[PDB]
Symmetry: D2
Subunit: 233 residues, 4 copies
């Protein structure tokens, strides 16, 4: 269950789910690189890791940019080591297209190192439900369908190398779309969730921590729903 001796990269680590993931992997003993798109977000990450006794760094990374990805990886490899645990946490058509093209960019870049080690964990984090109505449902379901299929396919491609590829599909998690809702809306929402509560960011992080472990070595191509029983597609 422990990750001592491993380097983990967590994209979008400055708040909410990404931050929780960074802290959890740190708690399990990994060296953690968390990333944000701004210098201010990188500084927040570095302060957070320091405050929690986690070794690593806060770096600026734009996953939409081949240049930013190549430059950031080379920097990590020179100063911390090769990341063997990569957690991807950084209208419906353009959103899905952009997001899967980013996942593909980052995954390809980190796979060289994983192939050298003959070991790896790629864990892709889905989007939380972003909005209540029909457009929200369309977007949530399309993004999740894309993520599920992308994950299954990359897992096939890299499996002979003892690299697993999985996803975590969060439902309604306690974050700002939810934290800003009128009470009538929050109540209606909670009524669709069998557990009758929103998820905590730490509850997504614990699942990620398990997927990253040696105990999950035979889990690949999977999408683990973390949604308190609320299934939408």
């Amino acid at each position: 269950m422990s990750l001592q001796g491993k380097v983990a990269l967590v994209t979008g680590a400055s708040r909410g789910i990404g931050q929780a993931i960074a802290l959890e992997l740190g708690r399990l003993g990994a060296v953690v690189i968390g990333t944000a798109t701004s210098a201010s977000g990188a500084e927040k990450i570095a302060e957070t890791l320091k405050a929690n006794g986690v070794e690593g760094a806060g770096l600026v990374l734009d996953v939409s940019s081949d240049e930013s990805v190549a430059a950031t990886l080379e920097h990590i490899q020179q100063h911390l080591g090769q990341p063997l645990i990569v957690v991807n946490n950084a209208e419906w058509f353009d959103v899905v297209n952009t997001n899967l093209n980013s996942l593909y960019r980052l995954s390809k870049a980190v796979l060289r190192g994983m192939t050298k080690a003959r070991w790896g964990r790629i864990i892709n984090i889905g989007s939380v439900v972003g909005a209540m109505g029909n457009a929200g449902q369309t977007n949530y379901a399309a993004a999740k369908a894309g993520l599920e299929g992308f994950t299954r396919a990359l897992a096939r491609e890299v499996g002979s190398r003892a690299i697993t590829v999985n996803a975590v599909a969060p439902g309604f998690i306690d974050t700002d779309m939810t934290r800003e809702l009128p009470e009538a809306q929050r109540e209606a929402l909670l009524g669709q969730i069998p557990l009758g509560r929103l998820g905590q960011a730490e509850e997504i992080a614990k699942v990620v921590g398990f997927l990253a472990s040696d105990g999950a070595a035979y889990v690949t191509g999977a999408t683990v729903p973390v949604n308190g029983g609320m299934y939408m597609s």
Copy 2:
């Protein structure tokens, strides 16, 4: 006499032990996956009741628990029988306490309808029986173990897929039903797992099998058991209605 209840026998605090003596019931614990689950829940600090259909199986479980330092028992239980389920649960409650982790791994094997029907009816019988105690505790974990791929050809594929589809829908529906009580209900769907059957395959046939699996190897029973352990934990509290495939990337439907 045949004796049907066998105890383990029972100041080192292992870091892994987080389930703080919660009682776990693992059906079909005498070998393979079920045995691995029973051991993993013991490593995690549960009191483990493992079951088999015979007194000899129940004794073998108790010896396994003993040899591994796990507190608990090997008991006879037939999940196909209302009488056996009722009587056995009452016995557990009187002697060891209310099972709040229940792992359904017992299950029987043109066959497809009667197999799936029998199996889902058993899952429902046992699950409904343990729910009072979980409801009273306002906490529970029900974990359902799917069937491994049992045979290579078309009848095998039909069975495997029909069982898996039944288990996935069942799990989701029972999760919906019992969620307001902070009971989770999840499934684990194994792929090809290294057992006595698969070790004895001719090399040409093992090779063809491994070719269908991205990881290029059979799964270990312990690799199923670790997933079960996680799902039993407080960290999986928001995971419910889920079926977790543990198959090395080999997805058959």
Copy 3:
């Protein structure tokens, strides 16, 4: 030899006295089948026979209880003796406000009955080396969570049952498919307050309830020779309203 035509075929449609089942019986009739529609009561069987007559469809209304081995055997014997072997079988005979604990008994009963009838009519199809089995799913039965739990469980059960049976019987050129309705224009829909009807229509992309005839047209197509390579499929007929 014509696309879509069911001339020369005998179709059994269970639960044919109203709504979706009646629409199916009339659609298969329009396509040229001899149609045996069934109900659980003599009254329902008479209504079917009158409906068929009124529409110029040859066939009969019979009393059938799919829960009973004796009823199933008797009904098949009657049909074989007087009309011939049914080679198209359409299953539409599913069994305090609805709660989320009802899904198990309902699904268990409905799949058991479906298996019973399907196994019985397979002998005749196996002999003919041709068949169509078409299973109709249950519409959404209530608004809210219990409604969704129950609808989803039934649909999941029917999808898996359909796919498995198709696999079992495919080598005999018998196809087995399902049609999974969404919200169809029926009484639970009528009883809703207008604000509730509006909210319901807002979960459906097409913005309307489906008609029984829209289910029936899918069934007619599946029954046809043109659908001979479609097997093990569940066709959703739900106006874009997907819930599982």
Copy 4:
């Protein structure tokens, strides 16, 4: 009842196999059919096929990868035949090329779909029917590609249906299994045999069996079917 009289249909990749069969089936039902190919010679062959089957319409050159080709083709059709309100999108493998294949194909579906949606939105009626890939390519890479494309098509179809449904436009997909085409007909015998053994019906499907499903989906009887992917695979499900 099944009639498409008065409707214009555009069928991409109509010069052979499944696309050709679709063109002919929509024509049998009474549609005016515009079938496309990537070359002038393919477009002329389409036109001769239509004539030989008594179907009104035309062959045209279309490159679904090109915004310019798509815009120019639609402007041509609108000027000479009318607005297509039925559109059928029909136009070794490597272990790490599945992403670029799916990405390209979906980007092309989206490009053509968005272009024909204007006319359908104006009419408040339409049918978009997307045809998936045929099973057959060799090895694990073939399986990876097939499965990824299928998952992409299913989700794409469901999402676009949600987006356009309020306009009485339906959007559905057909997912073929192992179909008798020019591309499967001469696969190595061991591969054909292995695939046949995975198919309950025990035979390859015919292109016409795909076309009949498309014909049904284009009909008014399918007006409540949207966002669906209909598998047409003889019971052989590959995921």
